[PDB]
């Protein structure tokens, strides 16, 4: 009767979170995504965490989620508690575009995810969420900017920022090795096929492991690219030979 | 072993099992009684017996074989409280299938509705799963006799004879040298091998006031439970 | 640690414990530990007692 | 009721779901089963018994038609079964009455697991016991698609669960090659039906079911005892 | 450690309106008298920090035009029960052109007291000293977070629950006047704060029968401390 | 213990101890029986006197449910006054639906279906009650029912309820029942509650007799106490 | 001790021990005695002050021109019960133009006072009336209990030690029909004073009477007309 | 449809939730407030930027109106509630009457919603403590706080967040009438006052002024050099 | 506690002399006597209550405040080139300890002897700060609070 309520509200008696902790610690495991700007253009890096030879791939999107004619992102958590965020998140954005006419703005879209997290967290006893996921898009007050959820419902402004506990790995080479408006569609691309060398496991990057997805403002448009399959390839081979000619110095 | 509150609502072990439903399957045999049902190939049999202790108590309101409608009959095992509802469910589900449908309801489609009813019980974890047996009885246009069993798991089959109550694995065994020797059935051979296994798994040879035959046959269609007199002819015609 | 061989008539009788003060023990206990040092003769230990329950 | 809806699936302190996890445990002691996309069809082949000679294998079905082109059969628990089927059954006419034309099979997988998902998250409740395979030819290519009690959907080329699905999983890993046809899915499916099945398979031990493009197709007995001779 | 929150002690008590009374303790102390020629009333701040401004911290709040009142525990939980009796004298005169007496205002407020549970909470954990004059004199009642509506001639109540009552009966008697009553409770109250006494600790609120709007304020409450 | 909390879960074997602990509560409780002959039921009911403790007819377990339906409650008096209403409450709407009297068939079990619902859920307990329903009818005769706390309600013709439950049956079936008129019962009920319930535990008792049946055509009311009194003095001359 | 905390456990000797928690709580309020005659019904209570300067707490309180209670549990269940009651009243008095009789008014307090002790997350009331009524049969004295039992009696007592009012009222029930008022009224007291320490006692501060009867509207008296009552009384000897 | 009591009585006397709640408040950075005559000042430490990412949406000094600012502590989702709850009372209060809205009903709005917001059933308290600062008519420079049990009071210099108390008794040792004479000197006294609670390199402080006739203004960084550099300045001349 | 062999039994009589021999009561001469341990919650309780000790001086963790002193000291009987930089290193990591800059002095103090030098430049210092500092950061909830 009460004796098997799990008590997903209550204070740690040290006086902090003992519930959303858990999953902030949990969501490290099995996920890297990450999205890198500064000038006219923005990507994102996912990874294919199994990459099994019985398996369809007719998707063509199958972490990326377009969310919005200006907008997508990339998630990392549970599977299926995604596809709750990422229904609920879609029509958000469209019943903005029913009142006022106007494509939502970035900022004010992410805030509204967030309320909906935090409230499953305070009241209702209810499990909450374990997904972390990222921000893209283009709107007419700044342009390309980038987000970072969190379960606890905090977001903020980033610029480098990843998700997976391997890709901790990743922001101190950010760190290291990040320039501030000098970003193209080349060497902002060959920098996540350098962080992805390294940060992930899997030798030489095979090409059916990684996933890369750019937003880009042509016109009017706002076209959101999703290359496929020879352009990954000579990435890396462009990616390779020029690891082969740095290390003639040694 | 036992982890949460494994041994107490319905949730899962680490075994990949639950409790609760297989306590319930047990909950049917403090009852100490034992239905058997047999199909032939015209006729559909129900015996099962009763127990009355005592002489302050009356013959007629003992009777487990319950008339669902005119042309469905059941008999009821477990407890005798939680039967006795299963079957207002029964009897209220085939009057609905007349006022939506306007035909007389299948008795297979009679067990998916009771079924489904018994899995939400196991599905909340706030009720009790209402620990009972269930076997129907029918002819169908075209398909012939019909047995089928509900379980308080929530699940169904068809059947050619099955007997359940208390003993189950000495009953079928039985009933499994009896069918696949390919034996006629008729009407009175189906009758008298209804009799005869449960009088060799429970060793009685009563007399004719105990057990109730509950048969419905093709030419005539409604549910008939037999009278005192009749049993005595159908028990005597087999003692040789 | 209290022994029922004891308490056979012969060796242990009579119960007698110890208990708090109510009030005015403690204020007992406050006026007798504050003249072997120097205190000003203007303050009260009724205030001092309230502020200790046990 | 008395309004409860406390959820009773929490996280652990490592960082997972321990219910999920043990919902997935009911799932491998189940029926085997084995599902196989081969470029014009796919095929759907259940492991179907009875404890005694005594049951009628007239009566309960496995492979289960949808709304008449998308098959479904599960590997998990019997009544957690007709639940979710019956619950897909009206879920794909509401797809009918607004836009008069038959659901994909991409689309039902997605409204499925929607269910599926949002049950474990609530109060109250356990979740399913039953794992999916659900097929369909819309559209000219053939669909393949696996669920799980955490609501998951994958696409697979050819799968098996139930139990002894990892000696299925390397065994189809070899036997399927890219492409085939429908009577070579049909004769390496019962290929590896029986991998844990008993001696004897009669027309009533498996119950196959198809989907051409002209539909989905359950396979009578007759047609199962004739291309059960000279099988694997 | 987790037992039902409406549970009866093996005892006959109950558990957690017990513990609601003791919170009481930890409050300030407030002290009212009732006298023929009228009521007045006392409280003391307890100013934490000389940053913190005194005048944003209150125990006297009015109730209607001739009603006062006085909280002892926690504040925010007494700001419910000030703002429902304010609310409630209130439809009395505007369905009956007169005023709710101050008996009667406290039967409203206790009402609420223990209607806490899981449908239709915790009990309130303040109590309170509600003074008037009404048709029958000046009056003066006390009541708690159980319920228990009662009249006092003089109740003290707070941290100094046990030490002001015994001093109080000391010295009081039935035709006391109302300046002899206002310099009585300050000497109570020097008696039992730790603090100095001036005009930023302590608040007094005095009605009368004719001066129905009871009002005190510094400047006045200096000449009261100076005179004793 | 662990199984014994809730009303919902089950026992490692199969049954529920929340039941099993509400049957025993009414086990401690004053002796009721009842009684049939062939036209009327018979109540009778062994009522206690501490000292003084009350009036001369103060809460007398002989209640009345309809105009020719009546009550013989033992155990937890509290909850027998509720199903006294819930009682109460049944047979109206089936006189404002249906348009004529309830049969004693009917209100047995649209009572035990209530009684049976609050042995499901963990918001509430079972009732810890016990009762008897007695009728007379020109076209179905009189009958006398039973309820259990768990819900099994069924036939008698003589039954007991409370402490001497094993000890008074035993001598009711050594009467009969066909042969004897209900002027005669009543007498012989008067000394089956003086001869059990020795003056030992309780020295003072009362004894209230209530009667149904053709003599008061078919209206249930209590018999004439102070009038005739021909029960107590009968059934003291069994002295030796 | 794991199934003494709800009021919805059994226990495993058949007793529900959150009814048997709640009767500790009648006795725990001051003692009050009901009696009657064949014309008048007087209920006679004792006050407990709190301190010496607050006023005693009230126990007789009006219902109906005919009815009226007395009280010996908590305060929040006294007026939740209390505003059931007058409720009660005035409504067949609007319904029927009549006033209630007051067996079937006890009837309806021991079915509200049913559903907060089978729920769960409920607790009893734990409270005790004496209900003093007159109707159109004659007076009548109701005792109840938290664990919804009514009685009809003709003199009872509830609260602390009222054991020993009870044994002074099984010896004088023979009395209690021949007596009109005066003589009535004092048998009663009598009970309350065998419930006192031997070095206090009535003093018109802490005792009230309420009496109904045929040509006699409910009234209360207390501290002004207790004083007619209290005379050619004799000490208690020792 | 939830009914479970979560906020309960202790044996001693004493809450649960509440003093858990003002933990929370005690783990975040430490954020000040002083007023004047004419401007308020209020600033925060502990800015902890990445130095690589951006930083105007970590922004947590707010107004209400345009009259109201806003300081909080504790964690920054429990704020965020708070805040556009707050905007909405503000603006439907001019709805009505047509003024703009005093400091003083709007600290009323939030502790009363804070204070049934524990009273209620099933319901995680809130873990913020607000500093309410803003100038009404007539002229008044006021400042209040909260506190996450619904308890409000007026100060003249509050502190918060990690090692207030330190704060507060640094500012307890500093009761001049002269500091709030000159503006700069108060805005100095400040980035005084936060210096002894982070590192303090000019960099991790965040002040915003209003002087009591516009909305709040962020100074430069270049501003925050000049101000360190003053306070560094006249510190060295104890000499 | 008391056991039953021989190996417990010369802790507690050597506890207790020390015990008794502080507090004999006959003549001690103004001995001041200071004990330190790291814990006190698996501690004797007799000697925390009064009559023996009445002194309990709690040491509570300092800030980056201290640290620039502990910097300049350990820093400061060594070859510190006129090229490094110390201010960038006490401003980056927040968590360390008098024992981990002596760690870190030594390692820079290493790092020179292996490229055959005498004093100790920059690079040394940035890398001895991210080799012997990595041991122990885990653990802190960043971007929650404020």
Not at chain 4, 176 to 192: R, V
Not at chain 7, 122 to 141: T, W
Request: charged share 25%.
């Amino acid at each position: 009767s009460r004796r098997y309520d799990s008590r997903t509200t209550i204070f740690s008696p040290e006086g902090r979170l003992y519930q959303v902790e858990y999953a902030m610690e949990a969501i490290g495991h099995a996920g890297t995504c990450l999205g890198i700007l500064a000038n006219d253009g923005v990507l994102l890096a996912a990874e294919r965490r199994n990459i099994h030879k019985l398996l369809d791939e007719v998707f063509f999107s199958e972490k990326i989620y377009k969310l919005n004619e200006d907008m997508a992102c990339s998630v990392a958590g549970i599977t299926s508690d995604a596809n709750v965020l990422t229904n609920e998140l879609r029509l958000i954005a469209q019943r903005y575009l029913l009142q006022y006419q106007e494509p939502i703005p970035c900022e004010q879209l992410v805030t509204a995810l967030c309320d909906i997290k935090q409230a499953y967290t305070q009241f209702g006893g209810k499990r909450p969420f374990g997904v972390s996921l990222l921000y893209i898009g283009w709107d007419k007050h700044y342009g390309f900017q980038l987000y970072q959820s969190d379960p606890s419902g905090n977001y903020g402004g980033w610029k480098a920022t990843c998700i997976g506990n391997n890709s901790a790995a990743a922001v101190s080479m950010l760190k290291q090795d990040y320039k501030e408006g000098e970003m193209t569609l080349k060497s902002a691309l060959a920098l996540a096929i350098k962080v992805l060398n390294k940060t992930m496991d899997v030798s030489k990057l095979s090409a059916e492991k990684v996933e890369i997805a750019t937003l880009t403002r042509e016109n009017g448009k706002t076209v959101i690219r999703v290359l496929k399959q020879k352009e990954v390839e000579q990435l890396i081979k462009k990616h390779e030979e020029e690891e082969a000619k740095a290390e003639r110095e040694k | 072993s036992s982890a949460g509150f494994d041994r107490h609502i319905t949730i899962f072990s680490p075994e990949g099992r639950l409790y609760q439903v297989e306590y319930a399957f047990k909950a049917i045999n403090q009852g100490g009684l034992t239905s058997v049902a047999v199909r032939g190939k015209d006729c559909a049999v129900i015996v099962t017996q009763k127990k009355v202790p005592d002489k302050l108590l009356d013959s007629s309101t003992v009777t487990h074989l319950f008339k669902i409608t005119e042309n469905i009959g059941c008999v009821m095992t477990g407890m005798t409280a939680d039967s006795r509802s299963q079957v207002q469910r029964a009897r209220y589900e085939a009057a609905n299938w007349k006022y939506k449908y306007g035909y007389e309801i299948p008795v297979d489609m009679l067990c998916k509705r009771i079924a489904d009813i018994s899995q939400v019980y196991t599905q909340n974890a706030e009720m009790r799963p209402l620990g009972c047996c269930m076997i129907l009885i029918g002819i169908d246009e075209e398909q012939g006799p019909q047995v089928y069993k509900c379980d308080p798991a929530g699940y169904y089959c068809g059947f050619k004879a099955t007997a359940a109550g208390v003993k189950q694995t000495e009953s079928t065994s039985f009933l499994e040298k009896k069918v696949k020797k390919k034996f006629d059935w008729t009407f009175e051979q189906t009758v008298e091998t209804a009799i005869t296994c449960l009088s060799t798994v429970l060793s009685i040879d009563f007399k004719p006031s105990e057990i109730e035959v509950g048969v419905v046959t093709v030419e005539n269609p409604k549910f008939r439970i037999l009278t005192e007199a009749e049993i005595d002819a159908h028990l005597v015609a087999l003692a040789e | 640690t209290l022994d029922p061989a004891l308490m056979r008539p012969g060796r242990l009788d009579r119960k007698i414990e110890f208990s708090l003060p109510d009030l005015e023990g403690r204020t007992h206990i406050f006026k007798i530990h504050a003249r072997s040092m120097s205190v000003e003769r203007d303050i009260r230990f009724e205030l001092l007692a309230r502020l200790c329950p046990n | 009721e008395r309004g409860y809806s406390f959820s009773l699936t929490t996280f652990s302190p490592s960082g997972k779901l321990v219910q999920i996890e043990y919902a997935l445990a009911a799932v491998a002691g189940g029926a085997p089963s084995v599902g196989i996309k081969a470029a014009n069809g796919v095929v759907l082949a259940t492991e179907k018994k009875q404890k005694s000679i005594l049951y009628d294998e007239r009566s309960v079905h496995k492979v289960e038609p949808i709304t008449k082109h998308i098959g479904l059969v599960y590997s998990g628990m019997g009544p957690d079964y007709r639940v979710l089927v019956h619950r897909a059954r009206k879920l794909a006419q509401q797809y009918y009455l607004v836009y008069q034309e038959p659901i994909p099979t991409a689309q039902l997988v997605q409204r499925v697991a929607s269910v599926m998902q949002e049950y474990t998250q609530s109060g109250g409740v356990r979740p399913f016991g039953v794992s999916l395979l659900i097929c369909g030819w819309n559209e000219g290519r053939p669909y393949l698609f696996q669920s799980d009690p955490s609501g998951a959907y994958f696409a697979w080329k050819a799968t098996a669960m139930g139990k002894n699905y990892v000696n299925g999983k390397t065994f189809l890993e070899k036997r399927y090659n890219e492409d085939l046809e429908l009577e070579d899915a049909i004769h390496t499916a019962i290929l590896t039906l029986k991998e844990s099945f008993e001696g004897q398979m009669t027309e009533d031990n498996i119950e196959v079911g198809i989907c051409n493009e002209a539909g989905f197709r359950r396979l009578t007995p007759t047609e199962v005892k004739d291309y059960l001779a000279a099988i694997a | 450690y987790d037992r039902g929150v409406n549970t009866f002690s093996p005892e006959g008590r109950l558990f957690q309106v017990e513990y609601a009374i003791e919170a009481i303790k930890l409050g300030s102390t407030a002290i009212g008298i009732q006298t023929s020629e009228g009521v007045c009333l006392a409280v003391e701040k307890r100013i934490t920090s000389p940053l913190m401004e005194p005048s944003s911290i209150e125990k006297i709040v009015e109730i209607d035009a001739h009603i006062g009142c006085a909280m002892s525990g926690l504040i925010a939980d007494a700001k419910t029960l000030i703002d429902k009796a304010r609310v409630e004298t209130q439809n009395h005169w505007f369905t009956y052109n007169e005023t709710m007496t101050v008996e009667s205002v406290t039967q409203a407020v206790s009402n609420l007291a223990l209607q806490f549970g899981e449908e239709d909470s915790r009990p309130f954990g303040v109590a309170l000293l509600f003074g008037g004059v009404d048709e029958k004199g000046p009056q003066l009642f006390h009541m708690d977070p159980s319920g228990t509506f009662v009249q006092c001639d003089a109740r003290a109540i707070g941290s100094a629950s046990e030490g002001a009552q015994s001093s109080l009966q000391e010295v009081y008697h039935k035709s006391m006047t109302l300046k002899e009553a206002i310099k009585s409770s300050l000497i109570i109250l020097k008696q039992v704060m730790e603090e100095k006494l001036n005009a930023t600790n302590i608040e007094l609120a005095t009605v009368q029968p004719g001066q129905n709007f009871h009002m005190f304020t510094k400047e006045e409450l200096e000449e009261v401390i100076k005179d004793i | 213990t662990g199984y014994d909390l809730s009303a919902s879960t089950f026992s490692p074997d199969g049954r529920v101890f929340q039941v099993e602990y509400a049957m025993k509560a009414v086990e401690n409780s004053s002796t009721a029986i009842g009684i049939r002959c062939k036209d009327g039921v018979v109540f009778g009911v062994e009522k206690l006197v501490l000292s003084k403790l009350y009036e001369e007819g103060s809460n007398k377990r002989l209640f009345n449910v309809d105009r020719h339906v009546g009550m013989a409650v033992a155990g937890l008096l509290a909850d027998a006054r509720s199903l006294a209403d819930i009682a109460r409450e049944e047979a109206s709407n089936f006189r404002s639906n249906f348009g004529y009297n309830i049969p004693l068939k009917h209100l047995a079990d649209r009572v035990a279906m209530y009684v049976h619902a609050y042995t499901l859920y963990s918001a509430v307990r079972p009732f810890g009650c016990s009762f008897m329903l007695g009728s007379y009818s020109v076209n179905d005769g009189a009958q006398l029912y039973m309820i259990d706390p768990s819900g099994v309600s069924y036939g008698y013709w003589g039954c007991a309820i409370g402490k001497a439950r094993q000890a008074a049956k035993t001598e009711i079936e050594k009467l009969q029942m066909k042969e004897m008129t209900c002027r005669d019962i009543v007498k012989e009920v008067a000394k089956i509650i003086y001869i059990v319930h020795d003056e030992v535990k309780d020295k003072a008792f009362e004894l209230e007799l209530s009667w149904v049946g053709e003599l008061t055509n078919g209206r249930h009311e209590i018999v004439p106490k102070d009038i005739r009194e021909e029960a107590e003095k009968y059934a003291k001359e069994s002295l030796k | 001790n794991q199934y003494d905390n709800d009021v919805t456990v059994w226990s495993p000797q058949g007793r529900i021990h959150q009814i048997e928690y709640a009767m500790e709580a009648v006795k725990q309020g001051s003692a009050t005695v009901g009696l009657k005659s064949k014309t008048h019904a007087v209920l006679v209570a004792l006050k407990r002050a709190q301190s010496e300067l607050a006023a005693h707490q009230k126990k007789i309180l009006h219902v109906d021109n005919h009815i009226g209670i007395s009280i010996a549990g908590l305060t929040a269940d006294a007026r939740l019960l209390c505003n059931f009651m007058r409720q009660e009243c005035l409504d067949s008095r609007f319904v029927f133009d009549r006033p209630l009789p007051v067996s079937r008014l006890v009837s309806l307090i021991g079915s509200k006072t049913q559903i907060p002790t089978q729920r769960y997350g409920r607790r009893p009331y734990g409270v005790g009336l004496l209900i003093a009524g007159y109707d159109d049969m004659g007076p009548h004295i109701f005792q109840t209990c938290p664990s919804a039992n009514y009685f009809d009696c003709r003199a009872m007592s509830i609260g602390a030690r009222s054991q020993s009012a009870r044994t002074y009222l099984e010896r004088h029930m023979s009395e209690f029909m021949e007596c009109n008022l005066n003589e009535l009224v004092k048998h009663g007291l009598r009970a309350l004073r065998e419930t006192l320490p031997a070095e206090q006692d009535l003093t018109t501060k802490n005792v009230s009477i309420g009496i109904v009867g045929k040509d006699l509207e409910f009234t209360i008296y207390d501290d002004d007309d207790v004083s007619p009552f209290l005379e050619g009384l004799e000490e208690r000897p020792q | 449809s939830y009914d479970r009591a979560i906020t309960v009585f202790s044996p001693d006397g004493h809450l649960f939730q509440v003093e858990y709640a003002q933990e929370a408040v005690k783990k975040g950075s430490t954020a000040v407030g002083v007023r004047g005559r004419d401007i308020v000042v209020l600033g925060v430490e502990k800015k902890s930027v990445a130095k690589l990412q951006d930083e105007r949406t970590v922004r947590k000094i707010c107004a209400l109106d345009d009259n109201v600012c806003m300081a909080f502590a504790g964690l920054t989702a429990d704020a965020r509630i708070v805040i556009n709850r707050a905007r909405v009372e503000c603006q439907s209060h001019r709805l009505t009457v047509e003024d703009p809205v005093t400091v003083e009903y709007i600290t009323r709005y939030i502790a009363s919603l804070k204070q049934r917001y524990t009273q209620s059933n099933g319901r995680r308290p809130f873990g913020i403590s607000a500093l309410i600062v803003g100038f009404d008519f007539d002229g008044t420079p006021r400042l209040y706080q909260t506190d996450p049990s619904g308890t409000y009071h007026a100060w003249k210099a509050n502190a918060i967040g990690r090692g207030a108390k330190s704060v507060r008794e640094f500012l307890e040792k500093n009761y001049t009438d002269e500091a709030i004479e000159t503006d700069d000197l108060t805005i100095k006294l400040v980035i005084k006052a936060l210096l002894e609670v982070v590192q303090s390199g000019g960099k991790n402080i965040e002040l915003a002024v209003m002087r009591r006739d516009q909305s709040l203004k962020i100074l430069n960084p270049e501003e925050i050099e000049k101000y360190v550099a003053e306070i560094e300045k006249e510190k060295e001349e104890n000499e | 506690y008391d056991s039953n062999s021989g190996g417990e039994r010369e802790i507690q009589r050597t506890m207790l002399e020390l015990l008794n021999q502080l507090d004999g009561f006959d003549s001690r001469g103004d001995v001041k006597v200071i004990m330190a341990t790291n814990r006190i919650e698996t501690l004797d309780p007799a000697l925390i209550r009064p009559g023996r000790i009445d002194r309990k001086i709690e040491f509570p963790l300092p800030d980056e405040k201290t640290k620039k002193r502990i910097f300049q000291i350990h820093t400061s009987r060594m070859t510190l080139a006129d090229d490094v930089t110390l201010d960038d290193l006490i401003m980056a990591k927040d968590d360390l300890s008098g024992a981990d800059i002596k760690a870190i002095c030594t390692e820079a103090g290493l790092m020179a002897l292996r490229e055959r030098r005498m004093k100790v430049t920059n690079e040394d210092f940035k890398k001895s700060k991210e080799n012997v500092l990595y041991k122990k950061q885990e653990g802190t909830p960043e971007g929650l609070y404020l």
